[PDB]
Structure 1
């Protein structure tokens, strides 16, 4: 199927508590493979991604050097952002960025990403065209002007179409036995009375990978979007994910409700009912 590589970067100022902490976490799909942290001298490889162990000292020296450079740039960006927003030196602020690429089954670029946020709000993002920017406010229009003057979009595009796609193809080949494996959900339906005239039906999906899944309840073949309580997909801690969807139904009507489960690990969607 399709695959993605993403880095999630966070720089947080902590006045009176040293220089801003900077963290960069890399993912292939829903598998974290590396973590860089300014609080640490060396990167940390994830044990659930042993395929990254394959990389030599040239890879690590170059990535460590890039991370140190990025740490310097983001620390300087936080200082400049305080100024752009007329903020005092007293408060803690956060700068985040996410970037990476999506590739099709052929390994070709489907799309690139490069977005930034300041204090949890969109700041500036590279558009899908990989040439123009979306600036959220007047401060980000200042950055957009500096970046258009320095032709930054050309440099980010070069990374996204080049390095990003090439390295993702390499990680996928090295970790093919795991990264290309979808684990289907293990499913079951539970039933608990709420009152003498209503009961909750809960449809469970456990042990699946990747995280993308669709759980829907239907009543007489109609989606119950508004009446379904859907928890956020959660990590089990062993590479897999879990999710549930519940619906409150009139007692005696349980057989009119069917849970529909869609996941990459399944050849065709599952239809489940409560089995008393």
Structure 2
């Protein structure tokens, strides 16, 4: 199936509580493989999956050099953005950046991303054509013009279409045993009633990987959304995910309802019915 590599960077200013804190994390699909924490012991990019340990010292040195450089750029940006927005030196602010690439089943380039946020909202983003920018507001137009003049998009495009895809492929190969695995959800349905009039049916999906999954209820084979609840997919902590969907039904009508499970790990759509 399809795959992605993404990096997520967060920089936070804390006036009077030191200089800014910077965190970087890298993922292939739903598996984290590296981290950097500017306040942590090592002061290096660190491994967070076993297959990344195949990389040698030149890699670790390089990734460390780059991420420290990323962090120093954000330290400058935090100051710049306070000026752009006419803000005091007294409040705490947040810069976030995300970039990465998607490949299809054939491991060929599908699309690339590079987006930037300030204080929990969009600031500037590279458009899907990887040749143009979208500025979120008037302040960000200053940045857009700068980056256009400096041919930033061209530099980013070459990484996104080349290096990003090549390294995602390398990782997929080096970590084949775990990264290319599909763990079908273990599924079951429970029944709960607190009155004689209605019951809750809860359809469970456990121990699955990757995180992408669809749970849907039907009644007499027609899509059913009213009187339903669907929790956010959540990490088990062991590299797998969990999700449930519930529906409230009139007593004696449990058999009308079916839970439908779609996941990459299943050869077909699964259907569950009470009991």
Deviations 1:29-63 (A, max 9, x none): 000000011113122211xx211000000001111
CA–CA separation in structure 2 for the residues paired with 1:225 and 1:130:
38
Unaligned runs of 5+ in 2: none
Query: 2:115: which partner in 1?
Result: 115
Query: 1:247: which partner in 2?
Result: 247
CA–CA separation in structure 1 for the residues paired with 2:227 and 2:159:
45
Query: 2:166: which partner in 1?
Result: 166
Q: Does 1:94 align with 2:114?
A: no
- TM-score in terms of structure 1 length: 0.97
Q: Does 1:224 align with 2:221?
A: no
Deviations 1:113-153 (A, max 9, x none): 11111111111110100001111100111110110011110
Dislocated runs of 4+, deviation >3 Å: none
The aligned length equals 273
Give the secondary-structure state (helix, strand or coil) at the position aligned to 1:114.
strand
Query: 1:76: which partner in 2?
Result: 76
Q: Does 1:23 align with 2:10?
A: no
Query: 1:274: which partner in 2?
Result: 274
* RMSD value, Cα: 0.8
CA–CA separation in structure 2 for the residues paired with 1:194 and 1:248:
11
Query: 1:153: which partner in 2?
Result: 153
Give the secondary-structure state (helix, strand or coil) at the position aligned to 1:226.
coil
Deviations 1:54-112 (A, max 9, x none): 00000011111101111110110111111111110111111111110001222211000
Unaligned runs of 5+ in 1: none
Give the secondary-structure state (helix, strand or coil) at the position aligned to 1:195.
coil
Give the secondary-structure state (helix, strand or coil) at the position aligned to 1:74.
helix
Query: 1:42: which partner in 2?
Result: 44
Which runs of structure 2 are paired with 1:108-147 in the superposition (5 Å)?
Answer: 108-147=108-147
CA–CA separation in structure 2 for the residues paired with 1:117 and 1:250:
47
Query: 1:265: which partner in 2?
Result: 265
Deviations 1:178-216 (A, max 9, x none): 111010000010111132110000000000000100001
CA–CA separation in structure 1 for the residues paired with 2:90 and 2:118:
16
